[PDB]
Amino acid sequence: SKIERISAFLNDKEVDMTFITNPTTLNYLTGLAIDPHERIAGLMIFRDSTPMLFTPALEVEKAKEHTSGLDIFGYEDSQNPWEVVKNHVKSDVKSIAVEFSDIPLAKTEGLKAQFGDINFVNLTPLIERMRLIKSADIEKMKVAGDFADKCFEIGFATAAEGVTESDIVAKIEYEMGVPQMSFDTLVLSGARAANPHGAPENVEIQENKLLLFDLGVMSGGYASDATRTIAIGQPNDFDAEIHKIVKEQQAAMDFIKPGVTAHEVDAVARDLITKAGYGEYFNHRLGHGIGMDVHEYPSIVAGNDLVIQEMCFSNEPGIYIPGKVGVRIEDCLYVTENGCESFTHTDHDLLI
Amino acid sequence: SKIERISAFLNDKEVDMTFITNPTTLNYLTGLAIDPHERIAGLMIFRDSTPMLFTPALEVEKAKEHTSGLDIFGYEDSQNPWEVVKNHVKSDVKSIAVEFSDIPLAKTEGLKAQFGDINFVNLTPLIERMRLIKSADIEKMKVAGDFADKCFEIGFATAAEGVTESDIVAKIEYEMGVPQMSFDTLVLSGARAANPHGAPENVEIQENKLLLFDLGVMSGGYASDATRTIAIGQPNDFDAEIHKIVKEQQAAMDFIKPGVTAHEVDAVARDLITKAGYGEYFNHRLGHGIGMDVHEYPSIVAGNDLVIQEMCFSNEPGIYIPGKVGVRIEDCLYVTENGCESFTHTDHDLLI
Ligand SMILES: [Mn+2]
Ligand SMILES: [Mn+2]
């Protein structure tokens, strides 16, 4: 149980209780997706008592739909959330563990008002080492990644008769309009794709030039991310296979496998680009981790030596010569021991 | 100058410097819209030195586009943001003012690592009293509010031939798809509009029933919000003018004017509903403040007596009998001394 891993840490670090705030961490622990926004909500795990969950007076009857179970209770706006919390917790509280990365001072200060000079302890690192592996629900990241293939389908088509980059984004987002993109959809024509602040604008697509897509979705809880780059009408030759240098992605999809550096795959790629001699230009991290957030561990930067086992991240290599001729390609992937596999199935070799 | 108001506070409270983090507060101060997301950025105002602005190594050349001016500098990922900050600030720093509401512990702790046992002071209340009045750019909230009228146009039409609530939302969002909605667009048919967790789903609209809209946009920086409720085919009579009780909104649009309670307009409304006798059901705050965020001060709750002067907020009254017959209406408005006025011009009396 994920909650049992946390009691264990509390016991092990002699901290009494948690007050958990990152709404993405909530649902990963609780299976419930709540967004209090301006209001307060926290997951309170203990060393050896029954875990509670605080909630606005309005979100509570719902939260008993997940259920697990957790002792659920709330506060109306008339009253001080921090008050309610203490008049529900019994037993004494010296330490609280919270997510440093997320919890603001308005909140720690709200607790201190009520509890006193409590030592705060950083839970964030733990949650991180817990999300780094999943294997629970890779199945969920499968369907999102598959919806991105369907996004690539709709996008390609839509580049056809005056159509601009925006039009293309807007049409993909219509789809239902399945709830939410995991990040801002990119459609970038020719030399706009080399910009390190490139964004779709209402500008016609360039015929005989390259078209980059890079997109992704939130399918209920988890997330996908991908980049295809295609040609609109017969492509340029220099451009033609700057695509090749980059499609070779495939010098790292079943080359893969657990127990190799981090300086590992950012080696089979960043070298094979200096091969054809564009080591610079390609001047950003190859690879970020993926799961419930579009960006997570592991980082796949060149420098230090994180071993790989059983992990989600992404394969985005691309060369950018400012004023170029656009190109990058990306799948996200999970590590099994095979071999391995990618979350997106669309063609790396195409033209429309 | 908004920045000059802050030095003044620093001087007045004998605090050396600010480290400002809420990216909506940045742009309100700086005219620049930056989103570092996982990364660090802060606006550093001093008592009597030249204000600086910290930025990722990647956002900086851009930030010199606004300009003002501010001393702009950054950090690559190789290096510790908190390090850079201290090796740029000279002079001694005992106190830092930050926005309690926004700044997490990972950040205060990052500062303390570098600076030492610094007293943190709460800037948030000041920024709030500063945003409560604008009059600078009401003009910007004018065009967004006008785009919401154009959203209401597109929406109405689109309720026509199998169309569901989702379809209608999706079509409005297509529009360009002018950047961003200020909040999740609501389209709710008949009895779905009474739910206090009502959300558009892929369900056909009910003929001879009510259709609520409530929507809004981000037009570059500021924001709008509105609710119209219309009829799809000849409406029910009980429903017909539960609309009347609620359209009477107009028992508070030029009744208005500065120097009356807060328990003021949540009196001309919440009574005139008990008039026809649905005081309960209508069980939420009438009125929230609006500006750069969809929700801001002033709160217009029943209880305490905030005077009005020269302020943005919204007029959303509506009765909800669970399993009802849907109805609410809302404009947002600014206080001038006339009279006053609303940001949305569409018809409060209609049927499609
Ligand atoms: Mn991507
Ligand atoms: Mn509204």
Side-chain angles (χ1 to χ4, degrees), chain A residues 1-141 143-243 245-327 329-352, chain B residues 1-141 143-243 245-327 329-352:
Chain A
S1 179
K2 273 173 271 250
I3 289 196
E4 294 173 331
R5 187 60 195 70
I6 296 174
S7 30
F9 163 94
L10 289 187
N11 269 287
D12 292 343
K13 292 284 170 93
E14 318 186 17
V15 170
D16 302 6
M17 164 191 58
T18 76
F19 192 90
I20 287 182
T21 33
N22 184 304
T24 294
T25 292
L26 295 195
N27 179 83
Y28 175 60
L29 298 185
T30 282
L32 154 156
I34 195 167
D35 215 306
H37 285 90
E38 34 161 355
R39 304 175 190 287
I40 310 303
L43 177 64
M44 287 160 285
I45 305 175
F46 310 99
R47 263 178 312 174
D48 55 47
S49 172
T50 218
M52 308 166 82
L53 179 139
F54 188 48
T55 260
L58 276 33
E59 297 295 300
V60 39
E61 65 141 22
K62 303 260 290 196
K64 290 154 181 170
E65 192 194 27
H66 324 81
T67 312
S68 143
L70 332 100
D71 182 12
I72 302 166
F73 71 106
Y75 73 105
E76 287 163 272
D77 306 335
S78 352
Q79 47 175 328
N80 172 236
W82 313 111
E83 263 184 5
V84 184
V85 173
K86 199 181 175 285
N87 304 357
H88 271 83
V89 175
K90 299 322 306 147
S91 66
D92 78 306
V93 176
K94 292 282 189 313
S95 293
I96 305 181
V98 301
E99 310 170 83
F100 279 26
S101 291
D102 177 276
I103 191 169
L105 299 190
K107 290 170 175 171
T108 51
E109 292 300 298
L111 294 163
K112 292 216 277 182
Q114 220 65 13
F115 281 77
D117 185 45
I118 297 331
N119 194 11
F120 286 94
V121 195
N122 198 8
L123 207 44
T124 290
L126 186 79
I127 305 304
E128 281 164 356
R129 80 152 271 240
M130 275 159 77
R131 288 167 68 193
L132 179 51
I133 66 112
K134 269 328 307 145
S135 219
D137 295 295
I138 293 177
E139 204 73 359
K140 205 84 148 50
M141 299 193 278
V143 75
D146 149 84
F147 269 60
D149 287 333
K150 203 190 70 158
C151 288
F152 285 130
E153 280 166 350
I154 293 157
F156 296 159
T158 294
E161 178 257 83
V163 298
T164 69
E165 293 172 334
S166 298
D167 289 302
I168 296 169
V169 172
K171 172 76 183 171
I172 295 166
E173 278 167 1
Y174 189 109
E175 300 275 8
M176 351 145 49
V178 85
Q180 198 182 354
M181 306 310 296
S182 35
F183 62 89
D184 294 358
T185 305
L186 293 175
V187 172
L188 295 177
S189 206
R192 293 167 55 79
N195 193 352
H197 272 75
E201 292 162 29
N202 189 72
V203 174
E204 304 208 334
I205 55 172
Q206 293 154 24
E207 190 91 18
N208 316 302
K209 223 72 191 189
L210 291 161
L211 206 57
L212 180 138
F213 277 79
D214 201 355
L215 45 88
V217 286
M218 296 317 218
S219 90
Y222 288 59
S224 62
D225 172 24
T227 305
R228 295 303 183 245
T229 310
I230 58 145
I232 305 309
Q234 282 138 314
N236 187 316
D237 258 78
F238 180 79
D239 303 14
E241 287 316 318
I242 285 196
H243 211 240
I245 296 158
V246 176
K247 80 184 54 169
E248 281 173 29
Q249 189 263 35
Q250 283 294 193
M253 197 58 52
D254 24 57
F255 305 69
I256 224 73
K257 258 164 60 173
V260 311
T261 350
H263 210 293
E264 64 189 304
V265 289
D266 201 357
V268 305
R270 179 157 284 165
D271 213 69
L272 195 151
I273 296 324
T274 63
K275 160 235 150 187
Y278 300 92
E280 270 150 12
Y281 299 130
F282 177 9
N283 232 310
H284 64 82
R285 153 163 89 168
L286 166 70
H288 64 93
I290 183 113
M292 213 163 313
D293 287 307
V294 81
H295 301 126
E296 283 171 26
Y297 287 70
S299 189
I300 308 296
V301 69
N304 225 334
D305 311 285
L306 164 56
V307 59
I308 309 306
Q309 291 89 327
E310 268 234 20
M311 286 193 183
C312 291
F313 58 111
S314 282
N315 216 172
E316 50 185 342
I319 315 145
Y320 323 101
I321 92 88
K324 188 194 29 166
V325 139
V327 67
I329 189 157
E330 180 205 33
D331 290 295
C332 21
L333 52 98
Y334 60 85
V335 189
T336 53
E337 313 76 346
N338 294 30
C340 309
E341 207 126 1
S342 126
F343 296 90
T344 51
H345 304 313
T346 48
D347 204 321
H348 302 67
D349 328 282
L350 196 34
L351 130 152
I352 314 205
Chain B
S1 179
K2 273 173 271 250
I3 289 196
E4 294 173 331
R5 187 60 195 70
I6 296 174
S7 30
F9 163 94
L10 289 187
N11 269 287
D12 292 343
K13 292 284 170 93
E14 318 186 17
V15 170
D16 302 6
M17 164 191 58
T18 76
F19 192 90
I20 287 182
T21 33
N22 184 304
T24 294
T25 292
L26 295 195
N27 179 83
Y28 175 60
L29 298 185
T30 282
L32 154 156
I34 195 167
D35 215 306
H37 285 90
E38 34 161 355
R39 304 175 190 287
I40 310 303
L43 177 64
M44 287 160 285
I45 305 175
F46 310 99
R47 263 178 312 174
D48 55 47
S49 172
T50 218
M52 308 166 82
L53 179 139
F54 188 48
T55 260
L58 276 33
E59 297 295 300
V60 39
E61 65 141 22
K62 303 260 290 196
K64 290 154 181 170
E65 192 194 27
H66 324 81
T67 312
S68 143
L70 332 100
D71 182 12
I72 302 166
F73 71 106
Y75 73 105
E76 287 163 272
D77 306 335
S78 352
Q79 47 175 328
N80 172 236
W82 313 111
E83 263 184 5
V84 184
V85 173
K86 199 181 175 285
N87 304 357
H88 271 83
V89 175
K90 299 322 306 147
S91 66
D92 78 306
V93 176
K94 292 282 189 313
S95 293
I96 305 181
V98 301
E99 310 170 83
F100 279 26
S101 291
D102 177 276
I103 191 169
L105 299 190
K107 290 170 175 171
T108 51
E109 292 300 298
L111 294 163
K112 292 216 277 182
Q114 220 65 13
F115 281 77
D117 185 45
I118 297 331
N119 194 11
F120 286 94
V121 195
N122 198 8
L123 207 44
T124 290
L126 186 79
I127 305 304
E128 281 164 356
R129 80 152 271 240
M130 275 159 77
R131 288 167 68 193
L132 179 51
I133 66 112
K134 269 328 307 145
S135 219
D137 295 295
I138 293 177
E139 204 73 359
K140 205 84 148 50
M141 299 193 278
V143 75
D146 149 84
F147 269 60
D149 287 333
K150 203 190 70 158
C151 288
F152 285 130
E153 280 166 350
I154 293 157
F156 296 159
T158 294
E161 178 257 83
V163 298
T164 69
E165 293 172 334
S166 298
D167 289 302
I168 296 169
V169 172
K171 172 76 183 171
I172 295 166
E173 278 167 1
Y174 189 109
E175 300 275 8
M176 351 145 49
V178 85
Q180 198 182 354
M181 306 310 296
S182 35
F183 62 89
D184 294 358
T185 305
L186 293 175
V187 172
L188 295 177
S189 206
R192 293 167 55 79
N195 193 352
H197 272 75
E201 292 162 29
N202 189 72
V203 174
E204 304 208 334
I205 55 172
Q206 293 154 24
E207 190 91 18
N208 316 302
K209 223 72 191 189
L210 291 161
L211 206 57
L212 180 138
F213 277 79
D214 201 355
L215 45 88
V217 286
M218 296 317 218
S219 90
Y222 288 59
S224 62
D225 172 24
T227 305
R228 295 303 183 245
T229 310
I230 58 145
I232 305 309
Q234 282 138 314
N236 187 316
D237 258 78
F238 180 79
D239 303 14
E241 287 316 318
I242 285 196
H243 211 240
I245 296 158
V246 176
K247 80 184 54 169
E248 281 173 29
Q249 189 263 35
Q250 283 294 193
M253 197 58 52
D254 24 57
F255 305 69
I256 224 73
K257 258 164 60 173
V260 311
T261 350
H263 210 293
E264 64 189 304
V265 289
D266 201 357
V268 305
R270 179 157 284 165
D271 213 69
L272 195 151
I273 296 324
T274 63
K275 160 235 150 187
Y278 300 92
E280 270 150 12
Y281 299 130
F282 177 9
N283 232 310
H284 64 82
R285 153 163 89 168
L286 166 70
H288 64 93
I290 183 113
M292 213 163 313
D293 287 307
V294 81
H295 301 126
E296 283 171 26
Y297 287 70
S299 189
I300 308 296
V301 69
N304 225 334
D305 311 285
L306 164 56
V307 59
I308 309 306
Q309 291 89 327
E310 268 234 20
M311 286 193 183
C312 291
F313 58 111
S314 282
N315 216 172
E316 50 185 342
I319 315 145
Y320 323 101
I321 92 88
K324 188 194 29 166
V325 139
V327 67
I329 189 157
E330 180 205 33
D331 290 295
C332 21
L333 52 98
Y334 60 85
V335 189
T336 53
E337 313 76 346
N338 294 30
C340 309
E341 207 126 1
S342 126
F343 296 90
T344 51
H345 304 313
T346 48
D347 204 321
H348 302 67
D349 328 282
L350 196 34
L351 130 152
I352 314 205

